[PDB]
Each structure stands twice: as C-alpha cells, then as structure tokens.
Amino acid sequence: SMNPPPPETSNPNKPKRQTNQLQYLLRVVLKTLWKHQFAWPFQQPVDAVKLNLPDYYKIIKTPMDMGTIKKRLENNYYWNAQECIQDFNTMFTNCYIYNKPGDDIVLMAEALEKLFLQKINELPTEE
Numbered sequence: 001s002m003n004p005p006p007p008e009t010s011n012p013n014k015p016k017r018q019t020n021q022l023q024y025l026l027r028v029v030l031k032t033l034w035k036h037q038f039a040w041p042f043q044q045p046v047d048a049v050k051l052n053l054p055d056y057y058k059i060i061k062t063p064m065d066m067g068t069i070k071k072r073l074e075n076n077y078y079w080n081a082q083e084c085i086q087d088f089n090t091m092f093t094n095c096y097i098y099n100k101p102g103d104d105i106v107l108m109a110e111a112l113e114k115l116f117l118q119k120i121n122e123l124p125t126e127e
C-alpha cells in the first residue's frame, strides 16, 4: 500500500501575505477546531496504509486536512482568507464523499463544520 505525497505546505514561488483575516483563521478558526474532541482524525493527512483504505486516494483526488492547513497558516502559505476557507471546505467535502451517511466520522466532520461556520460567520473585515 502507498500514500500519495502530502499537499504542498511550502512554495517560495507562491506569493504570500499575513493579513488580519488569515490571523483570525489561525488564532480563532484553526485553534477552535484543533482542540475539539473530534479533531484527531483530521489533524494529519489520511493514512490509507495504516487505516487499510486502499481505495481512498482512488476516490479522493484533492486531499486536505487540518495538519496541512495548520502548516499553511503557520508558514504564511496563503495570499487570502478564501484559499484557507476552501481548504477547510475541501476537507469536509472529502469526508462526506468517501464515507457513508451517519458514519461516526461524518458526525465528527459535521460537529467541526458547525463550529467552522460559526467562526467564519464573524470573519473580520480586512484592515
């Protein structure tokens, strides 16, 4: 069994910013989800080898996780908040696409997504 390379978290060619919205995405949004009891399956890329999911990366072609998002935020990988918000939404969508309705993992994603939406609802205006 083989995992793909992880998503990119570093690229000197990619233009970067440190904005108040991106700071909020780290300090409020990422931190709130990371500390949650249901955070652990989402704190690193899906390990298809260890989890015995040989079809995971056959079905999921745009992998994303909070480990990657955390690295992207801490290393100022993004230009804007929209990029980061998309990463969170890709993470949730992947979970819903791969898994069955009512699965424990789907309920975990839903609880995290509820908090995500609550926090992004009060994304600050750009300074």
Ligand SMILES: CCNC(=O)C[C@@H]1N=C(c2ccc(Cl)cc2)c2cc(OC)ccc2-n2c(C)nnc21
Binding pocket: 040, 041, 042, 046, 047, 051, 053, 094, 095, 098, 099, 104, 105
């Ligand atoms: C048929 C079995 N299905 C799975 O294992 C899917 C897997 N399901 C889980 C998972 C996590 C928690 C529970 Cl209670 C049940 C399943 C999961 C657990 C992990 O442990 C390190 C990593 C990624 C996960 N994950 C994510 C994220 N999206 N799908 C899955």
